[PDB]
Amino acid sequence: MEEIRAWRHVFKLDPIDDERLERLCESGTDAVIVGDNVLDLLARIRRFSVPCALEVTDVLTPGFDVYLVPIVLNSRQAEWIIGRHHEAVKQYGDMMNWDEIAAEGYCILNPECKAAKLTRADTELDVDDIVAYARLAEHLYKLPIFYLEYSGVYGDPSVVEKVKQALDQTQLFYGGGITTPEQAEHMARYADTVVVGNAIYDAFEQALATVAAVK
Amino acid sequence: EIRAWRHVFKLDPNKPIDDERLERLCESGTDAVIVGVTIDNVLDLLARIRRFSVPCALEVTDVLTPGFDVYLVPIVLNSRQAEWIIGRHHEAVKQYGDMMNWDEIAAEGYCILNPECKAAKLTRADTELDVDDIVAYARLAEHLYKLPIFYLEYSGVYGDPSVVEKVKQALDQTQLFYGGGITTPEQAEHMARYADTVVVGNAIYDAFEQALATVAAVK
Ligand SMILES: O=P(O)(O)OC[C@@H](O)CO
Ligand SMILES: O=P(O)(O)OC[C@@H](O)CO
C-alpha cells in the first residue's frame, strides 16, 4: 500500500504475541507501522496481506512497503529538522529509493512523551500556532503528511478540525490516546488518518474495535 | 512559471537606482527582477518596476508586501539554528498566512557557501562543506522537502562551476539557482551551463554595463 492517501486507520507497534499480531493484521486496518529485531517483526507481519511501514527515527532496513521519515517542525533544534536527515542522506543517499519514502511533518504536542523531550519540541502551542506549522508543511515545505503527535494523551478534536481546514493536498495524521471506538471516530471525522498505538498493549479488545469505528 | 527563468537580476531596495538604469535593466531581456528594509521602499521600487512587463519577485528574508508576482522564501539548509530553517517562517505565516496566495510562494533551499557574506554570519551557516555535503543538501531539497528551488549562494564571490555541475546532477524536479560574483559574460555563461537559473546582483551597482551583458551571455 504505497498509496497513503487511502489510509484511514493505522496501528503502530514498538513484545507482542502471535495471537494479537494476527488479529491486528487481519483487523481491516489500512497499515501496520513499525515505530535484526525489526526484520523478525517484519517477517511475522508478512504472513498477512496488510501493508507494513517502517517509521525511521535513526540515521535503512529493507523489506517494508513504505518508509516514513519524521521531520519535527516544532523542534527548537536543527538536528531533528535537517541534521540527522542530512547525515543519513550523505551516508546512504546513493542507495536510497525515494519512491518508497514519505516525509511526515510532525508537530509534537504532548510535553510528557519521550519524543518531545528528545527533540526539545515546543509543545505549548495555540491553534493558530499549529495551523501555521500545517501551512509550512504543505506550502513552504511540500510534505505528503502533517502529523499531530499527542502520543500518550488524547487531544482536542476541535483543534484537529481547525488544522484540517487549513490543509488541502497534505494528508492529516492524528495520533495520541485513542483507546475507545468513540475516540477513534471523533478524530477520524477531521483527520485523514488516525493512528492507534499504546492501547494495543494495554486494552487490546477496544484497540481492535477502533478499526470498524473508523471504517 | 519560474521554470522558464534562465537569467534573473536581484535588486537591493535600499540601494538607489535611477530611472534610466532601471529601464535598461528591466528591458534587457532578463527573465525576472528579484527585489531582495522597509515596506514603503519595497513598494516604491515595485511601482517603478511595474512600468515594465518583466516578472517581479520579492525575496522575503524578513517580515513583506502584496503586489509581487512571486514570493521567494529562503530556508537556510546549512544553518545551525532552527530560526533560519523554520522559526522565522512560522512567525511570519502565523501572522500573514490568512492573506497569502500559496500559488505565488516558492521556497528556496539555500546552501550558503561564502563565509564572508552577511547572510552566512547572520544565519550561522556552516560554509565549510565538501561536495558530498552539498549534494546531500540538494537531494534533501529534491526528495524529502520537495522544495521548488535549491539555491547555491556564493554572494560576493564567484563560486566553482564544477560544484554546480554535480549538484545539478542530483536535482530533477527542484530548480537549481546559482548566485555569486557574476560580472563577466564568461562567468554568466559558465554557470548557466549547469544552473537552471543564474542570479546577478552586485554587478548591477558596481559594473552596470557588464551586468547588462550577462543577459545575452546566458540567453
Ligand atoms: O500511542 P498512542 O497514544 O496511541 O499514539 C499513537 C501514535 O501517534 C504514537 O506515535
Ligand atoms: O551579489 P552577487 O554576488 O551577484 O550575488 C547574487 C545573489 O545570489 C545575492 O544573494
UniProtKB/Swiss-Prot annotation, chain A:
InterPro entries: GGGP/HepGP_synthase_I, GGGP/HepGP_synthase_sf, GGGP_HepGP_synthase. One of its GO terms (molecular function) is prenyltransferase activity. Keywords: Lipid biosynthesis, Lipid metabolism, Magnesium, Metal-binding, Phospholipid biosynthesis, Phospholipid metabolism, Transferase. GO terms for biological process: glycerophospholipid biosynthetic process. It comes from the Bacteria. It catalyses: sn-glycerol 1-phosphate + all-trans-heptaprenyl diphosphate = 3-heptaprenyl-sn-glycero-1-phosphate + diphosphate. Its EC number is 2.5.1.n9. Pathway: Membrane lipid metabolism; glycerophospholipid metabolism. It is an enzyme of class 2 (transferase). Sn-glycerol 1-phosphate binds at residues 12, 147-152, 177, 197-198. Mg(2+) binds at residue 14. Its cofactor is Mg(2+). Prenyltransferase that catalyzes in vivo the transfer of the heptaprenyl moiety of heptaprenyl pyrophosphate (HepPP; 35 carbon atoms) to the C3 hydroxyl of sn-glycerol-1-phosphate (G1P), producing heptaprenylglyceryl phosphate (HepGP). This reaction is an ether-bond-formation step in the biosynthesis of archaea-type G1P-based membrane lipids found in Bacillales. To a much lesser extent, is also able to use geranylgeranyl diphosphate (GGPP; C20) as the prenyl donor. NCBIfam families: GGGP-family (TIGR01768), PRK04169.1-1 (NF003197), PRK04169.1-3 (NF003199). Homodimer. Belongs to the GGGP/HepGP synthase family. Group I subfamily. This is Heptaprenylglyceryl phosphate synthase. It comes from Geobacillus kaustophilus (strain HTA426). The gene is pcrB.
From Swiss-Prot, chain B:
Pathway: Membrane lipid metabolism; glycerophospholipid metabolism. GO terms for molecular function: heptaprenylglyceryl phosphate synthase activity; magnesium ion binding; prenyltransferase activity. Sn-glycerol 1-phosphate binds at residues 10, 151-156, 181, 201-202. It comes from the Bacteria. The keyword GTP-binding does not apply. Gene3D superfamilies: FMN-linked oxidoreductases. Prenyltransferase that catalyzes in vivo the transfer of the heptaprenyl moiety of heptaprenyl pyrophosphate (HepPP; 35 carbon atoms) to the C3 hydroxyl of sn-glycerol-1-phosphate (G1P), producing heptaprenylglyceryl phosphate (HepGP). This reaction is an ether-bond-formation step in the biosynthesis of archaea-type G1P-based membrane lipids found in Bacillales. To a much lesser extent, is also able to use geranylgeranyl diphosphate (GGPP; C20) as the prenyl donor. Homodimer. This is Heptaprenylglyceryl phosphate synthase. It comes from Geobacillus kaustophilus (strain HTA426).
